[model samples]
Target: MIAISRTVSIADNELEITAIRAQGAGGQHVNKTSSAIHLRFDIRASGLPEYYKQRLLTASHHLISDDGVIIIKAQEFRSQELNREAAIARLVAVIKELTAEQKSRRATRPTRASKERRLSSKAQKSSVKALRGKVRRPLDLEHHHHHH
Candidate 1:
């Protein structure tokens, strides 16, 4: 079990992990193994305590989908084991940090970290999203930019 707090911890049962092929450097020889890790946790029907769910659901900023599932993709490392560990670490940190945020208030603003991090990552995700969307949208390939 991955402990987030005294009252709550997450188990492997709550997370679904799978290895999918990565996006680069595939065929110099032959990419026989998958190094990227994808972890999905369903919040709608989960064992997370009310304490966690209460805070966790509030974390539907980016990683969480409309169906109440959180996804973490790990491909920064080329090792499957490393990627898997990182994914789990992210899961725990997200819960721990989100749940910990409601303890009154801190400094000028402890909560701002959440917003800053989201904003920072949002820029990163924006670029990734645009690239992925452009690929998915054939019209983007046919005729580029809005130009207006």
Candidate 2:
């Protein structure tokens, strides 16, 4: 069992660990040992709180499988124990993130000063752009006339 918090303990049955070969630089040891641990947990089937389940579903959509299982792959370390622990730690972190509540946002109207500043900056930008025209010449004032 993994201790998520002081009150919450994740049971072993809730998690499924599969032994697989570790990937990347382990020399000959990588191919010989199955150190990689793939940890899977079905969030819907867990003993987690209902609110946490709902929050987890939305917050961890990417980590969650189509069948509602949370998948974690750990192969960073060469040892089976370290890799397994790392995977469990990652799972706990993901679950904790799900349990975390976001502060409710209060709808706010634009302040008078903010609105005025926005329009002022817009007008300033337009005025700056308008001055970027071709150079004016005195000959421009005189209209050309041709008489046969």
Candidate 3:
């Protein structure tokens, strides 16, 4: 059994897995055996919180289904046990991240000095642009003609 929350524990039966041949750079052994675990956890059926379900739906950017099932595919490791553990660990990480509290943003207004400073910077930028037109009116040898 895997504990999802204080009140919710996912029994082994609630989790379903289908095995497929592992892919990428393992030679003939990878092609021969169905070692990769394709794990599926049904959010609608699993005994998790409604808030968690909603958040998981929103937070699961890549792996969640339209039907609210969480799919985890682990095939990187050569061994089945390693792959299975990796899948579970990834599940725990994703769930923990989603369940963490989101910080609310507080509204703030710019101080008068800050607003004036911003305008002053914009005016300085405009003066710099104005200097572009001043470049062609050839000044005396007192000015350096180096093109930076």
Best by lDDT: 3
Which segments of model 1 are wrong by more than 4 Å? 22-35, 102-148
So what's the TM-score on candidate 1? Answer: 0.51
Q: Candidate 2: give the clashing pairs.
A: none
lDDT of 2 by residue, 20-96 (tens): 64444335543533455777776556676656556655663556666656777565567677878777777677566
User: Candidate 1 lDDT, tens digit per residue, 53-131?
Assistant: 6664665446665665677766665766787777777767665565675552222221211111122333333454433
**lDDT of each candidate versus the true structure:** 0.59, 0.59, 0.63
Please name the candidate that would achieve the greatest TM-score relative to the true structure: 3
Model 3 TM-score, all chains together? 0.55
Q: Who is ahead in lDDT, 1 or 3?
A: 3
TM-scores for the candidates: 0.51, 0.51, 0.55
Clashing pairs in 1: none
